Paper text:
Dye-decolourizing peroxidases (DyPs) are oxidative heme-containing enzymes that can oxidize organic substrates by first reacting with hydrogen peroxide to yield a catalytically active ferryl heme intermediate that results in electron transfer from substrates. The A-type DyP DtpAa from Streptomyces lividans has become a well characterized model system to investigate the mechanism of DyPs using a variety of techniques. This enzyme displays a typical DyP active site [Figs. 2(a) and 2(b)], with a heme coordinated on the proximal side by a histidine, whereas a solvent molecule is bound at the distal side. Complicating description and interpretation, the asymmetric unit of DtpAa crystals contains two molecules that show considerable differences in structure.
In view of the ∼1.6–1.8 Å distance of the two atoms, we propose the ligand to be either a ferric hydroperoxo intermediate (Fe–OOH−, also referred to as Compound 0), in line with previous investigations on chloroperoxidase, or a peroxo ligand. Importantly, the structures of the A and B molecules in the DtpAa dimer in the asymmetric unit differ in the conformation of the amino-acid stretch made up of residues 217–230 [Fig. 2(c)], which either lines up with the central β-sheet covering the distal side of the heme in the A molecule or is a loop bulging out of the active site (B molecule). Wilson plots calculated from the calculated intensities after the final stage of refinement are not affected by these complications; they solely reflect the falloff of Bragg diffraction with resolution (as the atomic model only accounts for this and not for other effects), and modern refinement programs calculate Icalc on an absolute scale. Icalc-based Wilson plots for the ID29 100 × 100 µm and the Cristallina-MX 100 × 100 µm data are shown in Fig. 12(b); a clear difference in the falloff of Bragg intensity with resolution is immediately apparent. To check that these are not spurious effects due to a difference in unit-cell parameters, we refined the 100 × 100 µm ID29 data using the 100 × 100 µm Cristallina-MX cell and found a change of only 0.03 Å in either parameter, much smaller than the effects seen with the actual data sets. Thus, the observed differences in the structures are not due to differences in unit-cell parameters but are due to radiation damage. Moreover, we observe an increase in the FeOOP displacement for the ID29-derived structures compared with those from the XFEL data, which is also much larger for the B molecule than for the A molecule. By comparing SFX and SSX data and the derived respective DtpAa structures, we see indications that local and global damage occurs at ID29 during the 90 µs exposure.
Author numbering:
A (entry chain B): 55 to 417
B (entry chain A): 55 to 416
Write the structure that this text describes.
Amino acid sequence: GSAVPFHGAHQAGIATPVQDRLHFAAFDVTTEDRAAFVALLKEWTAAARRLTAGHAVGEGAYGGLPEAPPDDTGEALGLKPSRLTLTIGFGPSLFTRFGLADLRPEALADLPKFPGDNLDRARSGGDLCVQACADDPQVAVHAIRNLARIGFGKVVVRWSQLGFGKTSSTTPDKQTPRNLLGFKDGTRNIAGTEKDRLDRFVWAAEKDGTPWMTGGSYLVARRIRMHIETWDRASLQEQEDVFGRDKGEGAPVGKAKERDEPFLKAMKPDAHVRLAHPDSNGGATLLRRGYSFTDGTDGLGRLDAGLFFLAYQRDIRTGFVPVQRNLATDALNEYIQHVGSAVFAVPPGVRDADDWWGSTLFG
Amino acid sequence: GSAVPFHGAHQAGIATPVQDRLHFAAFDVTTEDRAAFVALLKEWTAAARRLTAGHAVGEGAYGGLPEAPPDDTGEALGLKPSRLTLTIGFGPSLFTRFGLADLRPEALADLPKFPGDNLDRARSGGDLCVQACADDPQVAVHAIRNLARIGFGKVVVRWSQLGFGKTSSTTPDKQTPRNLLGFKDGTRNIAGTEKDRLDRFVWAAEKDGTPWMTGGSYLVARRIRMHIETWDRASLQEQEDVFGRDKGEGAPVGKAKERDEPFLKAMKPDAHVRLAHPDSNGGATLLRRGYSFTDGTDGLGRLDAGLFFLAYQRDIRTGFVPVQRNLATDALNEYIQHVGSAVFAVPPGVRDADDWWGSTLF
Ligand code: HEM
Ligand code: HEM
């Protein structure tokens, strides 16, 4: 459990084991030159091969010419690879550049406006994303800081989010993590072991209509604030009725164990699990891979905390869109607000040492 | 994942080995009722005994009356104590309430203005603080959230700071961590095992003039922004000349190993280590216990990066103040800006199960 292989038919960081920490960054492109952007994707891919093996970028962090800036900023020296994965994605706004408008996938759909949205434009969208996941947050931050530095003059950082899940040194791998509302989160999800369910619900197929995306996936990111101080004043019964599971064991109502299959008719009609379940959505099923956040306190002394929701799917129109539409009457809506949003096409994997991020799109 | 003992002559979270994560909160007091404030300190102490042992506060996180809110918010259920420490401090502004004016320690000094200061008043000061440190960020957030909930109507959060990784060491036997400039930070500190140096430089003594503070310490907090665009285009030689140590090993200039003693005359006259060293400051020595932070982007296309600097000392006048005055000509000033400040009196330890935070003052 020290490194995750970078090369594959698929990018790592989707179906590979969930790491303890997240640094997610969205970038905007500042160049109009296609050749200069392809050169960056090749340099970024070379850096990512070094970073995911626990090596410094370029000629290293020290021991070069004294009169040159070092190639690597040095804050990860002495740390382990920490299961780092680096996953790149392309936003809809990238396809307005470089003559790409006819290669935007139909599955990379713009999201509709949903009831109760309060999206901050500054923390939404982006031409590009890099998802950096690792067990050590300094390994993740060092990766984003050095990719941003390599890209300076061709890309800028639009927005950045730090996140946390479990701490693996102290918490067993099989234990479901709790979200900041104190409920177990992830019980009924697609697991990385389920190869057929990934082919059906997560990976883009050649016959889906966009050949360059074969073996890729589609990502939806939502920054969802929780109203923590309001939630903490709710009764135990009110909290359990919102979800349709009990708080201690996380069993479905009228069942005994966390992994018992739910009986949807025993839950309240607007309970979150009942509305989100595939049987309520024509079989629509998601891979959730999100992380908790706590950024600090706002001007009223309230905790700025919530869930940085990440979902992967074969098609945004048949995954996130139908399920989020069905949450229009969710009992949870009283306690949350969606304040950031973005969608990305995540290309296929880097096949070998000579391949590079985006090679199927750019040629 | 083990517990750090909560009781002692001193509070834990100072000499204790430095934990991976920080959640620091400053609170302002909103009650004028002395008895109501004393009742809060006792309830907070009872909660801290549970939290530091990995137990839920009050009657627990579930299995109570369905129609009542749970006593514990529940997001730490099934987690280990994770070396949680909870350290309380009292700000100078507290002493204007509850008839405490004559008990303000002389050693709790207001800081002067320093050249280059750009202090945000909203994220400075505070009537009191809680430093939560743990190896698990969820355990630290759970502690601050449950203390703030218990204090509803008597205290409000003024400002908070999360630290994602440590930039300090009280354990010279373990690897020294790096700050976001890529240098080891904590080589020449005070170790938790150096009992003589802790008595000389960190713990307040009865003869210092404030009996209620005997066994306590004084805390300076400084929020420091880093100019990483400016730093990352500097040459390797410029970076090493700024500090007086090499970047790869962290050895003093000319020497082979991190822990070899500095030879100050080989460093540039404005080198950070040369200006900050005790021999440059009449023997003034600090216990540094800070953490790195990043709070998103700056809105100008760049990552935000900084260091939340924490120093403990026996007297602010003989610790932080002379060292920071000597840093007026530091080469590092080109790459940093102080943007937040606070000082606190950290009372003595909770002696046993009948004692309570602040009992020697109140
Ligand atoms: C802060 C926001 C949210 C919280 C706190 C939350 C919490 C939970 C919890 C506690 C569960 C039950 C345990 C489990 O199976 O994971 C659950 C299930 C689920 N949630 Fe949410 N959720 C949130 C937002 C969303 C959103 C935005 C979507 C999709 C658009 C979503 C889709 C689901 C799905 C599909 C399930 C599994 C239902 C099943 O098949 O049984 N959730 N969520
Ligand atoms: C962003 C701000 C700062 C950075 C990046 C930084 C960095 C460093 C580094 C790399 C070292 C050498 C390794 C070590 O012995 O710890 C060091 C030493 C030291 N720093 Fe700083 N520092 C900063 C701010 C401060 C401040 C504000 C003070 C006190 C007012 C301070 C006091 C010291 C002391 C006392 C030493 C040890 C010198 C010795 O005895 O050898 N530092 N710092």
